[PDB]
């Protein structure tokens, strides 16, 4: 719309003010987070005064592969959407890859979920809109697919934006990542755990699992106990086995509308083809409704974090 076109064009403006990205041009302010693969810092780019986030992935790969990674990451200069995190530049130095991206002062919904305990369906409604729009922009305009939707990779800021990031744009980085140490929990849809990515559908499973996890405040595999639910340590291999050989999770009985409960149920169908696609979810009841609602997302966020109301 108009406020989005303003914001999108304002980014490209600040982006031209940044030239070559050298490691000496950055001053470290604060840490933002870390995962099992990278560490992210809030930083100020001295030549341009901007403030960005700088993820630092430390891979031990051969330099031929690493140079193709950097080269492939430069497609991120083409992703320009209000639902995709802004990208300033990637480069290599001191043995680490740097991806420099726009700073999202709300954080990832994984952090925000811990500060909130649960997230209200009215909010999640607006979140589902953004994720669906974001996967869409990735599937049509670039014919690439996310491959890692989970609450850690949905980012949110004080202007009420909800953007995707950390999507698989670099083919060689996907390969390189697959020599990782084991994680504690998976968002991988059951076909990918036996076969390969079944187009955008398998991103959609993860979105559903992320919605449930956030709606209830708890990793939903295995689904909550009988009395842990009225209160409203599994092996990684067993979770993967549970995802393939057990019925998918579902929302609680009476706490959420029926339109929302159906939406996630359409997302968590074990067959990727019977599962719903983007055009289906795009005109679902729960999305039709959550789009009409005038939810104040920016304020709900600043409240939840403990920052004073914005605007």
């Amino acid at each position: 719309d108009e406020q989005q076109r303003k914001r999108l064009e304002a980014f490209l403006t600040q982006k031209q003010k940044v030239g070559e990205l050298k490691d000496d041009d950055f001053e470290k302010i604060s840490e933002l987070g870390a995962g099992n693969g990278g560490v992210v810092f809030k930083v100020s780019h001295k030549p341009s005064g901007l403030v960005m986030a700088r993820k630092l992935i430390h891979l031990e790969i051969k330099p031929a592969i690493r140079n193709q990674i950097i080269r492939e990451l430069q497609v991120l200069h083409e992703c320009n959407s209000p639902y995709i995190v802004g990208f300033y530049g990637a480069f290599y130095s001191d043995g680490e890859i740097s991806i420099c991206m726009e700073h999202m002062d709300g954080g990832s919904l994984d952090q925000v979920l811990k500060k909130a305990g649960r997230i209200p369906e009215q909010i999640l409604g607006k979140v589902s809109i953004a994720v669906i729009k974001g996967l869409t922009y990735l599937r049509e305009k670039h014919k690439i697919m996310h491959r890692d939707v989970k609450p850690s990779n949905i980012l949110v800021n004080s202007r009420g934006e909800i953007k995707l990031c950390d999507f698989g744009v670099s083919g060689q980085l996907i390969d390189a990542m697959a020599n990782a140490f084991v994680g504690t929990r998976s968002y991988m849809s059951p076909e990918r755990l036996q076969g390969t990515h079944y187009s955008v559908q398998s991103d959609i499973w993860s979105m559903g699992l992320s919605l449930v996890e956030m709606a209830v405040g708890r990793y939903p595999i295995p689904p909550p106990d009988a009395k842990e639910l009225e209160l409203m340590p599994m092996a990684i291999f067993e979770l993967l086995d549970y995802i393939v050989n057990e019925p998918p999770p579902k929302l609680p009985s009476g706490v959420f509308s029926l339109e929302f409960q159906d939406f996630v149920n359409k997302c968590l169908i074990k067959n990727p083809a019977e599962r719903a696609d983007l055009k289906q979810l795009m005109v679902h009841a729960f999305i039709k409704r959550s789009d009409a609602e005038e939810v104040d997302f920016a304020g709900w966020l600043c409240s939840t974090i403990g920052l004073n109301q914005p605007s």
Binding site: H58, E60, I61, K62, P63, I174, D175, M177, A178, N179, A180, F181, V182, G183, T184, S186, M188, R192, L193, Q194, P233, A235, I236, F237, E238, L240, D241, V244
Partner: protein, 274 residues
């Protein structure tokens, strides 16, 4: 009491992090490797098992075994082990792409079994054998690090050590992967890892080169659906060797050989060769 006060170790440049620590190049009557463990505040019940394990690890001495020098609990819990010059086997095979003659490949395999055979002889399960934990001192001798240490690799609850399972997944035996069949870590689980390392040496590749999904490997290897593709073994590799690799990789652990037999096989084909 194999402890070390704070002021003794000169901690230096941060090198990198692994499955259960972060390594720094330190000083302690010479260059050491200081690995700052992950389990920060340990249990007095955990701490006594860690001390007990250090006792077993201090009494280990072999030409192919990184010397264990002891530990320090002062600022944070830490491990002090011999520092190695030069690169790990992982770097040589997969980063530097060092062009060893096939005769030296077999010799790297021989010394590694040689070293594993000693750990097993002293009833020590490595739990983390991989080319990242094999260094090549002076581009000659093989040196195995990061062995044992079960108690600080599997964080506790109070008096219960339960391996939540960590490490790089490519070398994990299936029964290890599943984490169900009682004590999953065993001599044969190391033999399996050793097999994966053979796969490295014989192919110049990591296994599952066409799978680029961590959890997909974990599920399929653990369900017996996935197996390293032995096709990829380079053409100039001994037949007697490829058959040895396949014995270590048996999906059922009980079919795998032990290192006495393994080391035997490699020396036999080492002699009878040029």
């Amino acid at each position: 009491d194999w402890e070390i006060p704070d002021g003794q170790i000169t901690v230096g440049q941060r090198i990198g992090s692994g499955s259960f620590g972060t390594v720094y190049k330190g000083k302690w009557h010479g260059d050491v490797a200081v690995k700052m463990l992950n389990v920060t505040a340990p249990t007095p019940q955990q701490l006594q098992a860690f001390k007990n394990e250090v006792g077993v690890l201090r009494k280990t001495r072999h030409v192919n075994i990184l010397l264990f020098m002891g530990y320090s609990t002062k600022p944070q819990l830490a491990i002090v082990t011999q520092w190695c010059e030069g690169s790990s086997l992982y770097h040589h095979l997969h980063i530097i792409e060092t062009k060893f003659e096939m005769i030296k490949l077999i010799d790297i395999a021989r010394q590694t079994a040689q070293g594993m055979d000693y750990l097993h002889a002293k009833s020590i399960i490595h739990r983390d054998l991989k080319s990242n934990n094999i260094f090549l001192h002076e581009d000659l001798t093989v040196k195995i690090g990061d062995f044992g240490l079960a108690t600080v690799k599997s964080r506790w609850s109070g008096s219960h050590q339960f391996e939540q399972l960590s490490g790089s997944i490519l070398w994990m035996a299936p029964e290890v992967i599943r984490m169900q069949d009682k004590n999953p870590y065993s001599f044969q689980s190391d033999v399996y890892a050793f097999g994966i390392v053979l796969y490295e040496l014989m192919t110049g590749q990591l296994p599952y080169s066409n799978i680029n999904n961590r959890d997909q490997i974990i599920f399929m290897v653990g369900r017996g659906y996935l197996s390293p593709d032995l096709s990829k073994v380079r053409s100039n590799c001994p037949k007697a060797m490829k058959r040895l690799m396949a014995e270590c990789l048996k999906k059922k652990r009980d079919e795998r050989p032990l290192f006495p037999q393994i080391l035997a096989s490699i020396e036999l084909l080492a002699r009878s060769l040029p």
